[PDB]
Amino acid sequence: LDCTVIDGNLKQIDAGSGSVVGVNNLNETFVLIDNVFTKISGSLKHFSVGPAGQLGVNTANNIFKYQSGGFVQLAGLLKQVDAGGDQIIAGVNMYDDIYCLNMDANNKWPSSNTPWVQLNGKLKYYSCGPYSCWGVNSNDQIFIMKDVSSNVCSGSGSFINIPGLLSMIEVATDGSVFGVNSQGNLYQRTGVTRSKPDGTDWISMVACPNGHKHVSFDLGVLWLVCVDGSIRKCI
Amino acid sequence: LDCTVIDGNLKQIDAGSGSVVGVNNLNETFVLIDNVFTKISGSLKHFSVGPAGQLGVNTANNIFKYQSGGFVQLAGLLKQVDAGGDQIIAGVNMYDDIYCLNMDANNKWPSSNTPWVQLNGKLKYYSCGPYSCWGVNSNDQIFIMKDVSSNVCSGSGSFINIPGLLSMIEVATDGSVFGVNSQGNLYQRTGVTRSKPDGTDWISMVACPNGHKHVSFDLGVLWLVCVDGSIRKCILT
Numbered sequence: 325l326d327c328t329v330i331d332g333n334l335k336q337i338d339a340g341s342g343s344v345v346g347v348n349n350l351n352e353t354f355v356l357i358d359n360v361f362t363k364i365s366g367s368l369k370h371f372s373v374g375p376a377g378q379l380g381v382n383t384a385n386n387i388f389k390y391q392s393g394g395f396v397q398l399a400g401l402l403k404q405v406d407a408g409g410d411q412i413i414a415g416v417n418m419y420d421d422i423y424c425l426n427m428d429a430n431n432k433w434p435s436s437n438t439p440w441v442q443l444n445g446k447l448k449y450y451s452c453g454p455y456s457c458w459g460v461n462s463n464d465q466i467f468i469m470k471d472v473s474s475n476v477c478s479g480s481g482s483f484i485n486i487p488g489l490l491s492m493i494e495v496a497t498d499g500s501v502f503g504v505n506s507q508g509n510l511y512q513r514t515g516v517t518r519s520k521p522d523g524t525d526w527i528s529m530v531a532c533p534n535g536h537k538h539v540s541f542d543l544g545v546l547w548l549v550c551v552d553g554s555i556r557k558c559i
Numbered sequence: 560l561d562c563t564v565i566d567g568n569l570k571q572i573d574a575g576s577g578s579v580v581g582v583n584n585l586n587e588t589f590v591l592i593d594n595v596f597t598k599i600s601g602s603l604k605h606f607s608v609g610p611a612g613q614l615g616v617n618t619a620n621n622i623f624k625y626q627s628g629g630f631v632q633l634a635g636l637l638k639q640v641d642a643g644g645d646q647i648i649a650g651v652n653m654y655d656d657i658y659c660l661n662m663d664a665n666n667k668w669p670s671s672n673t674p675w676v677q678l679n680g681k682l683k684y685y686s687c688g689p690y691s692c693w694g695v696n697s698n699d700q701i702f703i704m705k706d707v708s709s710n711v712c713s714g715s716g717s718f719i720n721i722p723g724l725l726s727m728i729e730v731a732t733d734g735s736v737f738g739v740n741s742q743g744n745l746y747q748r749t750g751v752t753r754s755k756p757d758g759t760d761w762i763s764m765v766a767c768p769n770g771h772k773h774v775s776f777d778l779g780v781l782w783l784v785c786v787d788g789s790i791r792k793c794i795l796t
């Protein structure tokens with residue numbers, strides 16, 4: 325990895341649809357604008373961007389979607405949310421229960437309901453890509469949901485355990501899968517394709533000299549939050 | 560129809576995926592950030608946003624996509640580009656030739672061999688939504704491409720003419736279709752469904768009392784640029 329340092333400090337970063345967003349330890353919300361992390365209105369502990377929009381959650385687990393000029397609350401509660409899927413939203417709540425919203429509901433406004441679908445299982449972190457979603461549970465075990473589509477956000481309905489341990493995991497729009505483990509090591513899943521969505525093995529890489537805290541990938545660029553909150557941008 | 564005036568001045572506006580973007584007469588590029596049209600770096604004569612990203616074109620007809628902190632030049636030439644399709648790119652070039660880029664290609668970077676698909680026909684303006692794309696030709700005749708999908712961006716391959724005249728047309732993520740004609744009137748297509756993607760008729764509406772220039776719709780909100788460059792934000796009954 326050839327990386328550069330990007331100025332700023334974050335605890336979480338997400339990249340998708342050409343955007344790069346994140347939050348810092350004070351839960352200030354940032355968008356990468358002309359190569360500068362730029363604060364926007366809001367208080368969020370997790371901020372995601374991708375083909376499903378700009379989605380975040382606050383400390384109280386309220387869910388927000390950026391629309392028509394600002395964050396608007398969506399009905400429900402989640403501790404983490406991802407917008408990487410194919411116009412679907414996915415996330416987990418404080419009890420590690422797993423939810424997704426289908427494209428037809430995501431794109432309906434006004435709405436007198438947000439018809440979340442519960443997935444069978446437990447995860448502390450859940451991220452979606454073009455044809456699958458990956459997550460980890462409270463014991464850092466790794467899972468894939470295959471056959472996810474825009475109006476079948478719940479997929480095949482049966483999670484598959486993928487050997488290994490990760491503390492968080494992100495799925496990119498080109499299908500790439502990266503994660504960080506409890507030791508702050510960084511990994512990519514090799515051999516991931518639409519035909520083989522589970523891929524083949526894990527390979528380690530190093531962007532942060534001091535340990536990695538958070539990772540996301542989009543459009544040939546790997547984004548890292550290091551242990552100290554500093555940011556790396558990698559090809 | 561209820562409308563308010565929103566501060567700013569543009570020649571073109573697009574809304575999609577909860578974002579609203581546009582360009583002004585100077586080709587300065589704007590994003591609606593915390594309810595204020597905020598200038599970001601870049602020179603573009605058309606700026607689009609939707610599930611396929613933030614896409615634009617400049618005076619030279621070079622194509623740009625916002626990626627990884629700024630605008631990145633793509634391979635190809637377009638005079639107008641739209642990002643409202645299902646992770647596909649669509650547009651027209653200086654000869655009114657029509658192009659789309661499939662989802663898997665749109666998401667691949669670097670892209671040294673970009674597999675643009677040329678569609679059969681001529682349009683001066685082309686916009687995509689969840690299951691179809693709509694466009695108009697240089698004589699303001701209106702066309703739909705049916706059966707468009709993420710990795711068959713060319714759809715059925717055969718454009719169907721829809722009666723009426725429009726100068727531009729935009730398709731929303733919920734399938735709504737709006738357009739503005741050369742006289743500055745504003746229309747919505749009625750009867751549009753997945754089963755009946757071409758819909759059934761046009762209905763006129765008035766947001767700009769002195770004439771409409773450009774329209775886009777996203778998530779229950781209709782956005783107008785009026786003839787004078789002023790902006791309206793409207794909510795339908």
Ligand SMILES: *[C@@H]1O[C@H](CO)[C@@H](O[C@@H]2O[C@H](CO)[C@@H](O)[C@H](O)[C@H]2NC(C)=O)[C@H](O)[C@H]1NC(C)=O
Nearest residue numbers: 348349350351352367368369370382383384385
């Ligand atoms: C920013 O958000 C984080 C996460 O919600 C806050 O840290 C949590 O604070 C709550 C009490 O509100 C505790 O129950 C949790 O143990 C904390 N979580 C973690 C991971 O530390 C943090 O306080 C917020 N920061 C500010 C400045 O408000």
Ligand SMILES: *[C@@H]1O[C@H](CO)[C@@H](O[C@@H]2O[C@H](CO)[C@@H](O)[C@H](O)[C@H]2NC(C)=O)[C@H](O)[C@H]1NC(C)=O
Nearest residue numbers: 583584585586587602603604605617618619620
């Ligand atoms: C902004 O962009 C527009 C569109 O490219 C420019 O207007 C065109 O100028 C070209 C010269 O390159 C003429 O050939 C066209 O007739 C013009 N088109 C239109 C619609 O006016 C305009 O000059 C640019 N403005 C600035 C300040 O850069």
Ligand SMILES: CC(=O)N[C@@H]1[C@@H](O)[C@H](O)[C@@H](CO)O[C@@H]1O
Nearest residue numbers: 399400401402417423440441442
């Ligand atoms: C994401 C979210 O808030 N999901 C909720 C779930 O918590 C709740 O139990 C249920 C009640 O019917 O509605 C939704 O599915």
Ligand SMILES: CC(=O)N[C@@H]1[C@@H](O)[C@H](O)[C@@H](CO)O[C@@H]1O
Nearest residue numbers: 487488489490505511526527528
């Ligand atoms: C993500 C993950 O669990 N990666 C593992 C790593 O922990 C382990 O140390 C290594 C050695 O066998 O194999 C894999 O790369």
Ligand SMILES: CC(=O)N[C@@H]1[C@@H](O)[C@H](O)[C@@H](CO)O[C@@H]1O
Nearest residue numbers: 722723724725740746761762763
């Ligand atoms: C989009 C479009 O072409 N609308 C036409 C309008 O031009 C015409 O004046 C009206 C009355 O015949 O019929 C349609 O509404």
Ligand SMILES: [Ca+2]
Nearest residue numbers: 338406408494
């Ligand atoms: Ca993501």
Ligand SMILES: [Ca+2]
Nearest residue numbers: 573641643729
């Ligand atoms: Ca559009």
Ligand SMILES: [Mg+2]
Nearest residue numbers: 565566567568
């Ligand atoms: Mg003003």
Ligand SMILES: [Mg+2]
Nearest residue numbers: 410474645709
């Ligand atoms: Mg799709």
